[PDB]
UniProtKB/Swiss-Prot annotation:
Cellular compartments annotated: Periplasm
Function: Catalyzes the reduction of dimethyl sulfoxide (DMSO) and trimethylamine N-oxide (TMAO) to dimethyl sulfide (DMS) and trimethylamine, respectively. The terminal DMSO reductase can also use various sulfoxides and N-oxide compounds as terminal electron acceptor in addition to DMSO and TMAO.
Xref: NCBIfam families: bisC_fam (TIGR00509), PRK15102.1 (NF011682)
Swiss-Prot/TrEMBL cofactor(s): Mo-bis(molybdopterin guanine dinucleotide)
Cell division as UniProt keyword: no
Main location: periplasm
E.C. number(s) listed in UniProt: 1.7.2.3, 1.8.5.3
Protein name: Dimethyl sulfoxide/trimethylamine N-oxide reductase
Binding site for Mo-bis(molybdopterin guanine dinucleotide): 112-116, 145, 188-189, 218-219, 239-241, 320-321, 324, 432, 436, 456-457, 479, 509, 641-642, 647-649, 735, 752-753
Co-factor remark: Binds 1 molybdenum-bis(molybdopterin guanine dinucleotide) (Mo-bis-MGD) cofactor per subunit.
Originating species: Rhodobacter capsulatus
Molecular function in Gene Ontology: electron transfer activity; molybdenum ion binding; molybdopterin cofactor binding; trimethylamine-N-oxide reductase (cytochrome c) activity
A GO CC term assigned to this protein in UniProt: outer membrane-bounded periplasmic space
Annotated gene: dorA
Amino acid sequence: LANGTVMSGSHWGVFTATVENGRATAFTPWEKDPHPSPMLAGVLDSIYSPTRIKYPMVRREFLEKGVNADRSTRGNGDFVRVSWDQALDLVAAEVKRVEETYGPEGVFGGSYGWKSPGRLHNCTTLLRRMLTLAGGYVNGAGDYSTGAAQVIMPHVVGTLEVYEQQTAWPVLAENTEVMVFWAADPIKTSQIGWVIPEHGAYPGLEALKAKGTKVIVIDPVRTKTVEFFGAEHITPKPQTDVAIMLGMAHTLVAEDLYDKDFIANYTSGFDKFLPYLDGETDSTPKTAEWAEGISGVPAETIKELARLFESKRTMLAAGWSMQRMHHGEQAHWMLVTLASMLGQIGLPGGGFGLSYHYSGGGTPSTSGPALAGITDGGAATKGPEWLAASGASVIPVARVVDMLENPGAEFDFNGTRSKFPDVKMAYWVGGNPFVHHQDRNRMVKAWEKLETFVVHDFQWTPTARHADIVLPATTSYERNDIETIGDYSNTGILAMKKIVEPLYEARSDYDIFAAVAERLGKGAEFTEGKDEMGWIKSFYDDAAKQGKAAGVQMPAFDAFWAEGIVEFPVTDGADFVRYASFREDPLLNPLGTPTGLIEIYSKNIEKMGYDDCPAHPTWMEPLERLDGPGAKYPLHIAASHPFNRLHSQLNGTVLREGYAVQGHEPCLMHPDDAAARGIADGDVVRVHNDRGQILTGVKVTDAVMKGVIQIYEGGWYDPSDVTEPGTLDKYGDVNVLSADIGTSKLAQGNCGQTVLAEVEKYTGPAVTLTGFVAPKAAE
Ligand SMILES: NC1=NC(=O)C2=N[C@H]3C(S)=C(SO)[C@@H](COP(=O)(O)OP(=O)(O)OC[C@H]4O[C@@H](n5cnc6c(=O)[nH]c(N)nc65)[C@H](O)[C@@H]4O)O[C@H]3NC2=N1
Ligand SMILES: NC1=NC(=O)C2=N[C@H]3C(S)=C(S)[C@@H](COP(=O)(O)OP(=O)(O)OC[C@H]4O[C@@H](n5cnc6c(=O)[nH]c(N)nc65)[C@H](O)[C@@H]4O)O[C@H]3NC2=N1
Ligand SMILES: [Mo+6]
Ligand SMILES: [O]
């Protein structure tokens, strides 16, 4: 049996595995990783945990009745174990039947999800590769992270902005005087990467603290970011950040401090925004005192913050939670507008940055080449013949349930009108929509419209428990692959080597789709005559020929594989200043906006005439907010990203023991809010509102501000009874309480953090958790 060490990587970093008699027994972090993540131990455990999917399973009702099956029982665990040949035939038959009967509009292939890194074993692209050969599919656009901000930014600054390289960390160390983390917890969220992370922000944060720079955190929760710096902490009522920004802007106008030259030469439309700010249009001057009444943040604090930002070199590093809410578009639009008034855009250490908390943004980029990977083939096809009627071929990701509920209906998106297709089948790989999507009870009922639902995963998630057909996938650690280290830095290329043999009857997504493509008569088209190592060698060889051309030397494929990693050099990467060239000469280097300047007022958005997205940053009442006029529930749920999970990943591993409270997902509550309900620390509680009800376990702390509770997203939904409408979730999936609505007509983003609820001590009948053990028939 195999004994030795093997280096690989993941979403949590680079590591070395210890293998003993063919079993991975420890994962040790890479020696050059400046800040390893404590979740590595959970990654290892994820391979062997009790929720690992062993065999291909078919839903008993679906097996016996096909499309006439009762669809209300999806999720009850009544599965039938089948052979791979049986399951593959069924999957291929169903894909073919739906394509022939309904056309490409009948198959939803968006399959949103964080999957695993790797250029070959990219399950979502592999699924689209197969669906392409099958006749077509409906896809998803945008994402659940910057759903509103990625659509508003291009109308304001010209590009996406959120997924672009930031002013380098070192530039910040020598020039920044005031660092503001606005709705950002970089310490918590910098642990993972889309591709292998280099954890480059930790060293960057460490240099700011060593320099003694003043740090301000604006967040309702006292996070590790606050604690790490001993920062001045401002706690607004969730969803009122725009009110505070207007209050600050108003102060800068009233005391005549803002930068008129900056505004005059680099922006457009300020004069159309001024009247609103002064109350000329609505009779409501947006003062610091007016902001105080809405946000709860003292008027004088708001004025002192405004003045400090204007007199010191300030960097506004904003997170994404505050645009994952109703009217999300205004949050970063107003932030840029405030940034414009301060006049530091394009100066070393000043301006704003939207990716300092995500995937190493700000870590100096190397001069290394770009790495490519398997494609879905669409760019060299001549896909479906599509047209309105049948409907749109692309929907904004968060409108999947609206689509199911309203086939043929029209919807708005960024100035256009399209129709919802009539989807009959959904195929999901590498995602967990039964945890990640909003308003669980609404979505549980809307799923009944799908005849067939196919899922691949290696863990028994809520999504997999609800499938008609479940196929067991392998982890990254049971195969070979290649991937980039550093989403922005491009630190190097890593060989992701196989650690152990596939467990049970698990198969890679690639092999599964290969076999399904074979049954549709398209085997060679899918595989291209290459095997695993042939694909990986061609990605590397292409990068090397690109490297060569640019003067970067790279070893031959087998030399690279023997080493396991290539590292690229940093040349001018550490001196990068975002927007510097625009500041230096705006006429020669203008933005990609109609006017070529920062658009505070948008004529383009004006012509769309959307009620929920005015032509300039505006304060608007959200669906529900803490202490809002007529608010029905009293507590705001900060349903943010989990510290010891990657979304739902690693919930069914040994890490859960360290944070669960009586077996349930933890809930942070302030002592005063606990006292009022006669709630003691460690008690099981019922959290509920009009959309659903869930059980969590309380942790009493003053880390959360009064009026706010913290229940992280990602908990595995564990319904008491799937056939009972609004059944109680026994574990703690925060998305059973959120609403499923668009941010506005412009972006249609998710409003996953626009949630209010009530909490009461749980006194009902004892409950048995069943989400962390495999379905009985799957053992
Ligand atoms: N109320 C909410 N608040 C929020 O803040 C919140 N966040 C969003 C955002 S920001 C995201 S990402 O943009 C989504 C993430 O949902 P996702 O389904 O990507 O989550 P995961 O728990 O990472 O599911 C991944 C899934 O894939 C499996 N897997 C891994 N490797 C592969 C593979 O190679 N083969 C297969 N077939 N499967 C793979 C994992 O095991 C895992 O189950 O959440 C939003 N919701 C929010 N709500
Ligand atoms: N460890 C960890 N696990 C993860 O699951 C995770 N996921 C990754 C992904 S996919 C992304 S897209 C990003 C998300 O990065 P993002 O900035 O969207 O993260 P959140 O955890 O949702 O919110 C961050 C902070 O915003 C605060 N906040 C909430 N609402 C308000 C409010 O209205 N006003 C203010 N001022 N602040 C508020 C929260 O309290 C929290 O500390 O993180 C990434 N990093 C990840 N880290
Ligand atoms: Mo995200
Ligand atoms: O994401």
